[PDB]
Amino acid sequence: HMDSHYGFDKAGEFHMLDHTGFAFPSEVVNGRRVLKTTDNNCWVNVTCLQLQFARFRFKSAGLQAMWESYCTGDVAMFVHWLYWLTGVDKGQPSDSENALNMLSKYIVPAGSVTIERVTHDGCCCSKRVVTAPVVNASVLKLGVEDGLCPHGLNYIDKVVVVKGTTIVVNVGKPVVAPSHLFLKGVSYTTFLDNGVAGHYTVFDHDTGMVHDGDVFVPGDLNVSPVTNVVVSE
């Protein structure tokens, strides 16, 4: 029952635990619900922000009831579940792109992406239509190398057609590039190396500002190291 009502394994074990320790102070900013920066929770803030920018749902009605409570202020349960699923200890930093990939199988697919595979001089070509909540591809219009073709030339994987909304997680280090080279998206998570810690933050393309914790700081997409983007059409 517990595993069918909420849609994930060991659901009975989780729901008996105490979620109060993860009730971070939160506010509403530009309609989005964001978390105040504390206990290195920035990876949780930017992870749940992309779920809001993507307008994603969860497959089971039980998990969505948890996610809906997160957006209304009851952030204790879902935040704990992100630590419980990803296997991260409270107060410790984590990877937001790793969290989104583990969340993908629980999210209803709300979009589509065509990934074209071609080489340096069009020697071998193929197209496929991906329909997943999170797809690991290049956040740039360039693409990434993906091995050799039967002619000894490197493949290139780029997103050419976008339907609906999906989260494209970059396959590599945080990339800085001109804004007009990224895929057309609505929000970009950036990752700054402060010197061995890091700071996660989201860039709202509409307002042209940046979600930083519970505030709204200025930012420039041209100098932001993007790690994943909520691509839309």
Residues found near other proteins in the complex (CB under 8 A): 40, 42-43, 46, 93-98, 101-102, 104, 115, 130, 132, 134-137, 144-147, 157, 171-174, 191, 196-200, 227
Residue 56 interaction partner, one of Zn ion, other proteins, none, beta carbon < 5-8 Å per kind: none
Measured from the CB atom, is 87 or 150 closer to Zn ion?
150
Residue 5 interaction partner, one of Zn ion, other proteins, none, beta carbon < 5-8 Å per kind: Zn ion
How far is Cα 202 from Cα 51, in angstroms, rounded to an integer?
A: 12
Pairing of strands 111-119, 154-169: antiparallel
Please give the residue ranges that form the binding site for Zn ion (CB under 5 A): 5, 123-125, 149, 151
Measured from the CB atom, is 16 or 196 closer to other proteins?
196
CB-based contacts of 121, cutoff 8 Å, min separation 6: 153
CB-based contacts of 83, cutoff 8 Å, min separation 6: 22, 89, 90
Measured from the CB atom, is 40 or 69 closer to other proteins?
40
User: Which residue's structure tokens are 């009730």?
Assistant: 23
Measured from the CB atom, is 61 or 108 closer to other proteins?
108
H helical segments located in 9-93:
11-15, 42-53, 61-72, 76-86
In whole angstroms, the minimum distance from the beta carbon of 143 to other proteins comes to 12
How far is Cα 2 from Cα 8, in angstroms, rounded to an integer?
A: 8
